[PDB]
Design a protein around this ligand. Structure first.
Ligand SMILES: *[C@H]1O[C@H](COP(=O)(O)OP(=O)(O)OC[C@H]2O[C@@H](n3cnc4c(N)ncnc43)[C@H](O)[C@@H]2O)[C@@H](O)[C@@H]1F
Ligand SMILES: *[C@H]1O[C@H](COP(=O)(O)OP(=O)(O)OC[C@H]2O[C@@H](n3cnc4c(N)ncnc43)[C@H](O)[C@@H]2O)[C@@H](O)[C@@H]1F
Lengths: 251, 252
């Protein structure tokens, strides 16, 4: 595992690119400049062993970088990365973490502390499995919480309903750990979209199994709940990438 | 018209992010560093009246910034930007100009030279619909030529087939003026995709009108040629935006 080259430059360029040209009509600018954001980011991990972090490490970075989020537009997802992002459509239909400023700046990047100068490793980072969970999950854990905590109105949640190993919904997922429990009374409704991958056994449905657990979880938060399996707009995206599938048949 | 603010820092930040993180398994890095590429880009329009630009103003920029392009992967489009970009899918199915370094760096950006210091106008840029052709198309003109010149194998051309005012193929489109003519014998085939927008009149069709005109040109340059209208993978894409259109009806 090799850390990203020139982390600062990459960070600052993405930041600046975003500030000036990305999501102008879709998401707000943040107060802080890019240097202030770098400093809040860099201090969370710098000059410490790579496993020396906890859930508060990136807090200041997150307070600074957190945008207000448009009401009704926030998408969550589990095990269906590509499909959620394709349906969300780079912010035209839904917002994901990746469209926000910090998710955008840190997407796919690899970084870690070391004690010795220059304060970070330029060679190798530990496998995440070696660090305690609080350190391992310090960045995306906090990013997940911050993003969820900012959601207003309706929220959408896309899941895999054809994984035989992994339930559609799980408390131990990032959604289960950081997102759902952090949704505030500004949220009105959790709309689930269940993906049944084309040509695969259907494993989970609305009203059954882990989806029934979710339903209950949600009502107890006092939100409203709906659930739908392969709605047509999602179905159609699945079918462009597999047009010969039985599910994508005309006439 | 309003120029992009902090043009240099946008260019530079864009170029470094692309360099270290973008399209890594899809598109080659260029030899030249970001700093150098700013220079070639700046010198091209800097310290000249805006309309004082020609086909060759950005030739040095493009030499430095041109990447080789994966065979069978390049896509050109005319009149159907969003669909073509959606269908190409950020370089996974096809590559577009805006997936390339120069395309990625300058996409959306707005800029212009002035005679006086600092040589560019951070405050205003003329209605470029008022500059001479060669000067208004000086930048994307060169980009398109260079892109086309770098294309290898089969190329795809997606076109609007439901436009009564604008032929699917014209010799004065960016395609007709700068791409088609710059297709080298590295190219073997032009595969035309015709977009019949959902619930509009079909205007053009494979083998008639401008398309037959296109087909004749392509074969003259000794490439192979084919053409389809709304292939299913494209249809399905359009239907996601308009699920209740007549032409997206599905089986019982
Ligand atoms: C916040 O959380 C969920 C996504 O995580 P889940 O565990 O619910 O879903 P899953 O597919 O099982 O996890 C995939 C892993 O990828 C990581 N991840 C999330 N976001 C990013 C970005 N931008 N870059 C790289 N990795 C990312 C997670 O940490 C998971 O471990 C979403 O609804 C919200 F994003
Ligand atoms: C090279 O060009 C074509 C796209 O241009 P066409 O003129 O063939 O198609 P149309 O949709 O009618 O016109 C696009 C016009 O916009 C300019 N342009 C092309 N690409 C850009 C970018 N990235 N930013 C701003 N303007 C752009 C052209 O000047 C056209 O006049 C594609 O096949 C190739 F990319």
């Amino acid at each position: 595992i090799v850390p990203t080259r020139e982390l600062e430059n990459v960070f600052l360029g993405r930041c600046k690119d975003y500030e000036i040209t990305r999501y102008l009509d879709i998401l707000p600018r943040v107060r802080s400049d890019c240097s202030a954001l770098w400093k809040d980011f860099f201090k969370a991990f710098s000059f410490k062993n790579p496993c020396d972090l906890d859930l508060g490490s990136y807090k200041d970075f997150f307070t600074s970088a957190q945008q207000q989020l448009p009401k009704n537009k926030v998408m969550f997802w589990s095990g269906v990365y590509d499909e959620a992002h394709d349906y969300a459509n780079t912010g035209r239909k839904y917002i994901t973490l990746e469209d926000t400023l910090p998710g955008y700046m840190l997407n796919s990047l690899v970084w870690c502390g070391q004690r010795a100068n220059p304060g970070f490793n330029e060679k190798v980072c530990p496998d995440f499995k070696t660090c305690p969970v609080q350190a391992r999950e310090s960045f995306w854990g906090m990013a997940s919480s911050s993003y969820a905590h900012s959601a207003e109105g309706e929220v959408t949640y896309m899941v895999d309903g054809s994984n035989p190993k992994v339930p559609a919904y799980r408390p131990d997922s990032f959604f289960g750990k950081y997102e759902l429990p952090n949704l505030t009374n500004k949220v009105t409704r959790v709309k689930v979209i269940v993906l049944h991958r084309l040509g695969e056994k259907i494993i989970e449905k609305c009203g059954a199994g882990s989806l029934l657990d979710l339903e209950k979880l949600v009502k107890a938060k006092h939100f409203a709940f709906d659930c739908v399996e392969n709605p047509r707009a999602v179905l159609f995206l699945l079918c462009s990438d597999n047009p010969n599938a039985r599910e994508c048949r005309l006439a």
